Amino acid sequence: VKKEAAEKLLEKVPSDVLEMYKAIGGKIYIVDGDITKHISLEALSEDKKKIKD
Amino acid sequence: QSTQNTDSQTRTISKNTSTSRTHTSEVHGNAEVHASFFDIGGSVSAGFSNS
User: Are residues A7 and B18, on separate chains, in Cβ contact within 8 Å?
Assistant: First the structure.
């Protein structure tokens, strides 16, 4: 009789395609602190306000 | 929201090689009954094949 030999049908593995999608990449955006300056006097005042006759 | 479009062209050049070694044994049997007008025979055979 003649031997099969068996060279196989399956080629490589999914693992390369699996690794392709497995890509995670970079996520999220900068927020919160930004720059922050601010300056004006809407908080408190100062002006002569007494009483007399 | 964001949309992403992606194109990918992959060229995979692959090599393979192989050997194989087969060792085959075989044990054959046979019996035979022949009959004629006046001649009747019988035969027994056995075979031993390596490969």
Answer: yes
